[PDB]
Design an enzyme around this catalytic site. Structure first.
Site, short mmCIF file in Angstrom:
data_model
loop_
_atom_site.label_atom_id
_atom_site.label_comp_id
_atom_site.label_asym_id
_atom_site.label_seq_id
_atom_site.Cartn_x
_atom_site.Cartn_y
_atom_site.Cartn_z
N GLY A 1 -1.12 29.78 114.42
CA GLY A 1 -0.60 30.20 115.70
C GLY A 1 0.57 31.16 115.68
O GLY A 1 1.20 31.36 116.72
N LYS B 1 -12.00 19.24 115.69
CA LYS B 1 -10.81 18.72 115.04
C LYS B 1 -10.55 17.29 115.44
O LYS B 1 -10.76 16.88 116.58
CB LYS B 1 -9.58 19.56 115.36
CG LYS B 1 -9.62 20.94 114.72
CD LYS B 1 -8.34 21.72 115.08
CE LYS B 1 -8.24 23.10 114.43
NZ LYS B 1 -8.07 23.04 112.99
N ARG C 1 -2.92 32.19 97.19
CA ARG C 1 -2.47 32.53 95.84
C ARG C 1 -2.07 31.29 95.04
O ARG C 1 -2.31 31.22 93.83
CB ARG C 1 -1.29 33.50 95.90
CG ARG C 1 -1.67 34.93 96.28
CD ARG C 1 -0.62 35.90 95.77
NE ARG C 1 -0.95 37.30 96.03
CZ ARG C 1 -1.77 38.02 95.26
NH1 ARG C 1 -2.34 37.46 94.21
NH2 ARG C 1 -2.01 39.29 95.55
N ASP D 1 -12.11 29.30 116.31
CA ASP D 1 -11.72 28.24 117.22
C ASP D 1 -12.16 28.60 118.63
O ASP D 1 -12.02 29.74 119.07
CB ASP D 1 -10.21 28.02 117.20
CG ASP D 1 -9.73 27.28 115.97
OD1 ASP D 1 -10.56 26.97 115.09
OD2 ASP D 1 -8.51 27.02 115.88
N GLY E 1 -8.17 31.07 114.55
CA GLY E 1 -7.94 30.15 115.63
C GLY E 1 -7.41 30.85 116.86
O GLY E 1 -7.94 30.71 117.96
C1 LIG Z 1 -7.53 24.17 112.26
C2 LIG Z 1 -8.30 25.42 112.68
N1 LIG Z 1 -9.67 25.30 112.22
C3 LIG Z 1 -7.66 26.67 112.12
O1 LIG Z 1 -8.15 27.24 111.17
C4 LIG Z 1 -6.44 27.22 112.73
C5 LIG Z 1 -6.03 28.45 112.40
O2 LIG Z 1 -4.82 28.94 113.04
P1 LIG Z 1 -4.62 30.47 113.49
O3 LIG Z 1 -3.40 30.88 112.71
O4 LIG Z 1 -4.38 30.39 114.97
O5 LIG Z 1 -5.90 31.18 113.11
#
Ligand SMILES: *C[C@H](N)C(=O)/C=C/OP(=O)(O)O
Ligand SMILES: *C[C@H](N)C(=O)/C=C/OP(=O)(O)O
Ligand SMILES: *C[C@H](N)C(=O)/C=C/OP(=O)(O)O
Ligand SMILES: *C[C@H](N)C(=O)/C=C/OP(=O)(O)O
Ligand SMILES: *C[C@H](N)C(=O)/C=C/OP(=O)(O)O
Lengths: 272, 271, 273, 272, 272
Positions: free
Chosen positions: A149, A77, A161, A20, A231
């Site tokens: 996040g 997105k 899984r 991201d 992300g």
């Molecule tokens: C939606 C985005 N492409 C994504 O994969 C978000 C991931 O969240 P994070 O846990 O911050 O890597």
């Protein structure tokens, strides 16, 4: 076949890390670190969580800047169900739209009809049935999501899984019970059968959510994903440039414990 | 190869294993007479107080701790995070503790510990959990209470549960053992092995809440082979003296005179 | 090598067979002439137990000796669950198999017989894979995947056959690291779960039982992957037990030949009520 | 002590079968069959169950006729709490009073104070705590009861396994945990400690309830009982005379399968 | 008899006040005020309540100082079930261990086996059954506790009345109902009978919890206690030296209203 063409585009990302990025500086970092693609969004998922507020498609000006800053594919997105946001992203030339749950749901009852677009879509899922419903809608690539996040892989492990265990269950399942299985997981029967015949998801499957360390990323790969999304783990950590390279190398060498050890050594603070 | 790892763990019987987050704490533990050290990012009382995702220690910190001492070095990995354990094995730790004080990585499965050459520690609250961890390949069992509270009440509970169940099993009618193994959801063969040995088939240490020498000797008098101290030493007012006192208490756990002596003038226990 | 594996080995002889409940020597002789691979001596057929009620126990040994004398194929006999003394008696009078059976009145609600203490093999019932493996760990040399006894309705046997075999197919393709949790979830001994995974089948012979009333039922059990079928009530509570018994045996012998299934089903008379 | 003398009297019954009898004829059948004692009562437990109505101590006339008919000890049932019934049974010279739950409860809150009697008492129990409470009241012998009058041993197996499992639990229990155990089962601590030290019940323990076949009786003995009561299985069966001897022989030879097989052969219809 | 010897030791405290002390200065104050003994603890109960945190046996160094500062008996608290803490206290020569609920429970299922110690133990109770269970475990003295550290006697009144009312109930109770009573309160029958025969608790019974004024202390004595504990009421009040002497004199002259009035006059602030 136009869908199989889109599926083939996403196959080229196998073995890669998608990162991201919310500006062009992050996009360069990701490309130099070896990412197979970048994902343009307004705020990384950890900030969307902490801050709240409605989260929408990035301003097309920001996407243009990110497209100019890199040569690797650029994803963006769109809110779930916000097909006009996706029309705009296609119009400005992103390579993939991620119909993403980290953005604010725009249609609580329907996803985007992804067959109406020329470019491939990524969709999220927590289980096989969700994955197959997204694919029937036209998704060419599946993101098996946990909790974005939080830096906690526990839900991504659960969902990887779950999807893979359901595929394995399907592999050995009595043919005559597949009809009821497709009703039970509320998935199109043809896609359920295709999954059983292939022994894997009919499109590329990446993990996403809480991947915070190279160990996490290689965990997702040893669990059977074709790649990972990161992300927040890179750009909320103490050393994004080094952590980004480390996660890429972890995913490329996900079975080599010595390499995993080396790239994990002296990596500074992971995300909060 | 599993009996090899079970035998390795025998060398720690009678010892105290001490959590350390850096090399200074590691040397203090060795000089106090600890039989091994446990490398982790934060002591359990800090993980509990501060929250946040707690993972495997950076390999750099583990290498520092290995280079500071000559007694075995253990390290924590998140439950189910078998890649963290692969890394820990690759950097040469002596034991991986698949530990509940770290943030759970897999809510449904523990690590397949038979895929590793080095021994694993796992926690348990009862005998069925202990036997399940052992069947997965754990060479040593940590009978855990509450990490990071200084309150042994849950450790006392779980030690009395495990050992009470072992004592129950020893006098149990053979024909009822099948149903017993179902009830505690444990592999029958390991249940039988526990019955035939009269003790846990692997080394069993108490952990969680051990704050004072009296606590540590309490765990030994309840029949543990040793004790972990995670927070009691380094969240206390005088770590160096408390560590020696806890080690001496475990070495002399039936000697009230010694227990009184080493407990005398020990300063503030952990908050 | 081990005594248990010898008992398991002996039960292999029953693959492809029909085991018929008999309550006297006449029934046993009919069953043997119809081509049954073994008979099951019990006091009352399951339909009668169900309809009459009352405590159902091991058959009187006089009845069993009469049945042993009447046939040369193996003689099995039912013992109440947990009643190891009933099994000791059955063993002393020389039966070939004890069926620790739920159709008799449960004698111990918390434990089954320790079947490893006996020289002769045991059959046990199960509704699911965990139950089957626990019975096998206690020493059952053969498993009877039971539906509802005495109803003539196969629906529960179909449920439990699909359940056991579904779980085995689930196990066969299961990620190895998840088998420990699976063994906990179905409360089965891990070594037996792994053995089942490796073999791709139950580690002992697996028969269907409960509600098999027609040749179509029997052949259905065989096409769902059973090694054989028990028939308790469906033969001797029917209008033509001799013709039906041969028909069910033929159905199990030739369970994929619909022409034969059609043929042996033609004019079979009334099935059980 | 007077209590230990009573306890010693009941020890002489080890290895025996006690049979319920309602008249002198049944009592003679029991003695000839080898029973170690008979139990005089108005109606066998199966009849009390099927018929209902208040069940009390036998008329003293009937008990005298039973005492005149046999030389083995004569027991008689008294209602729980009905100490005057027991006073009467003692005055007419019975050898044991069975304060029995198959009779109609006379005091829902107290059992008879059995120390006030010169003769030994039998009491029932479902678990170790009950047994020890009965023993503290002065019971010299414990009958571990299942369901009387059903011909189903399932509950007696449960209760025999419960008492014996509790005793085995107690034998290997940490001494310091025994105080809490005595509280948990609501039993006098000294009797709990005595049970731990003996590794068995401090008084004779017979099984009772549902023993219908010789297999049943030997089952109870192999489960660890000192003897069995049979209330209904003999005199509600098709051939009481043969069945009573078979049960006696089963209890005497309870580990001999060939004997058990032999005495079970051709035994007629068991009770309904 | 070693237990009766321990019981006799505690009898010598009849008519006395035991005062909690956390240092040697408080210990001298209590002795000079006329306390029959002092209780060494880490914090008085009102501070343990307000502050929280795990409360354990006092450091042996502090107990040594308190032992040196006084000639009257010195008690020390150990956590419930923490028998090693009690072993240590015995080893350093305290005169009594109080297995105390104001400290943090160490074994939620068992108390200390007090028979394994040479010195007498105090235990708390809220009712007769608790008191008798502690005595069976070896307690030589019973503290009938209310709510420590609140200055509110209401729970101590409740528990003193409960214990004494149960004793009075027991005094006149039909002998035959004592077995069921012992089951109901989960107490050893022999101790229940001893209590009925004595008409009082088989060991010394002090009140504790919320005793804040001389009126409170004399209330406990007129309710039938042999003495009182004061943990917070002295050393959390405005004038500990004078309040301590006043409470001692109240307990010595607990029926003399004129003395109670005089010693209560001008006593300053009680505890918060
Ligand atoms: C939606 C985005 N492409 C994504 O994969 C978000 C991931 O969240 P994070 O846990 O911050 O890597
Ligand atoms: C898992 C770690 N090695 C441990 O033993 C934790 C103990 O908890 P504490 O309560 O901090 O001693
Ligand atoms: C227990 C006996 N072997 C059996 O299989 C019972 C079958 O029931 P039914 O429905 O009567 O065939
Ligand atoms: C109380 C009587 N002595 C007895 O033992 C009753 C047994 O019941 P049953 O089931 O009739 O043997
Ligand atoms: C346990 C101690 N000996 C005591 O009696 C505590 C009393 O509490 P308080 O209410 O503060 O007197």
């Amino acid at each position: 076949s136009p869908f199989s063409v889109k599926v083939g585009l996403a196959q080229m990302l196998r073995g890669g890390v998608i990162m991201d990025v919310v500006n062009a500086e992050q996009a360069r970092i990701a490309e130099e670190a070896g990412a197979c693609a970048v994902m343009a969004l307004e705020r990384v998922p950890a900030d969307i969580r902490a801050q709240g507020g409605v989260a929408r498609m990035s301003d097309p000006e920001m996407i243009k800047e990110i497209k100019n800053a890199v040569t690797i594919p650029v994803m963006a997105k769109a809110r779930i169900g916000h097909f006009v946001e996706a029309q705009i992203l296609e119009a400005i030339g992103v390579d993939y739209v991620d119909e993403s749950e980290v953005l604010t749901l725009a249609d609580e009852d329907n996803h985007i009809n992804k067959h109406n677009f020329k470019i491939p879509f990524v969709c999220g899922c927590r289980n096989l049935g969700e994955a197959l419903r997204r694919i029937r809608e036209g998704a060419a690539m599946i993101r098996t999501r946990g909790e974005a996040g939080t830096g906690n892989v526990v839900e991504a492990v659960r969902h990887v899984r779950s999807v893979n265990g359901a595929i394995r269950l399907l592999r050995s399942m009595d043919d005559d019970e597949v009809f009821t299985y497709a009703k039970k997981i509320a998935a199109p029967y043809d896609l359920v059968v295709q999954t059983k015949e292939l022994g894997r998801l009919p499109v590329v499957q990446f993990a996403a959510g809480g991947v915070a360390t190279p160990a996490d990323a290689a965990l997702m790969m040893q669990l059977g994903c074709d790649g990972v999304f990161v992300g927040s783990g890179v750009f909320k950590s103490g050393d994004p440039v080094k952590r980004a390279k480390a996660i890429v190398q972890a995913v490329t060498n996900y079975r080599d414990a010595a390499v995993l050890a080396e790239v994990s050594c002296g990596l500074g603070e992971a995300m909060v």
